[PDB]
Amino acid sequence: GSMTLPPELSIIEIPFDDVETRSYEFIEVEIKGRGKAKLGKREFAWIPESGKYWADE
């Protein structure tokens, strides 16, 4: 299921690890229903597009 991956891996950025991880004030910005930005102290995941891999600009 949706679980965090060990630091032994290269790069992994899933919304789950940012749902919770920084539980104080995790950013919540959504748009178009297909894209959503999230913030955190140990994560950087934010792409309001269809690919979610940064294919807009």
Partner: protein, 191 residues
């Protein structure tokens, strides 16, 4: 509006942390010196150092130096954040007499002074307040800005709370980016 909402700034009396980014005979934006990666760097808007014309030199109170191949720390291509971080050598800071004014944590309502102008020799300033949005990366400010002021830091008595990137509603409210959160939360020491 020029003269009423803005007040002329005495050349040489302007913040030693603010610098004007010039592209030939025209200015492309504003920026400031601050610590983000750990050493020292120049903070400005993304467009200015990406979408706008090629930055040829930096101007500070008439003093202008040439911009060479300077390494860029990181710059998000997003239009909401729109920021760029350039790593400028230390022997360049002194050439213009630029100091490193650190950015601090913004507040719900703090006083800010925005500085801008057509050139570094023709500077003016505005006065407004800064606020924090629900999103820790978005700041709201009433500081009266003009065209070409993008990159101007929100100077407060306590320090810099954010940087002017655009506006929320034309003629109503502007928009600034919270570098504090991007610096110690979004930016990693890997890139």
């Amino acid at each position: 509006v020029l003269g009423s909402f803005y007040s002329p700034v005495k050349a040489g009396d302007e913040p030693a942390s603010l610098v004007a980014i010039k592209s030939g005979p025209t200015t492309i934006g504003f920026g400031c010196r601050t610590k983000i990666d750990g050493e020292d760097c120049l903070l400005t808007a993304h467009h200015v150092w990406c979408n706008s014309m090629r930055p040829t030199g930096l101007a500070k109170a008439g003093k202008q130096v040439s911009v060479e191949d300077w390494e860029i720390s990181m710059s998000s291509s997003d239009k909401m954040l729109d920021f760029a971080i350039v790593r400028v050598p230390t022997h360049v800071w002194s050439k213009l007499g630029v100091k490193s004014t650190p950015l601090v944590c913004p507040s719900s309502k703090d006083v800010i002074t925005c500085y801008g102008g057509s050139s570094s020799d023709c500077l003016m300033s505005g006065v407004g307040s800064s606020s924090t949005s629900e999103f820790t990366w978005k700041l709201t400010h009433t500081c009266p800005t003009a065209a070409g002021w993008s990159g101007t830091p929100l100077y407060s008595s306590r320090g810099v709370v954010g940087m002017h990137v655009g506006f929320e509603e034309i003629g109503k409210l502007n928009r600034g980016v919270n570098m504090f959160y991007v610096a110690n939360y979004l930016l990693r020491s890997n890139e």
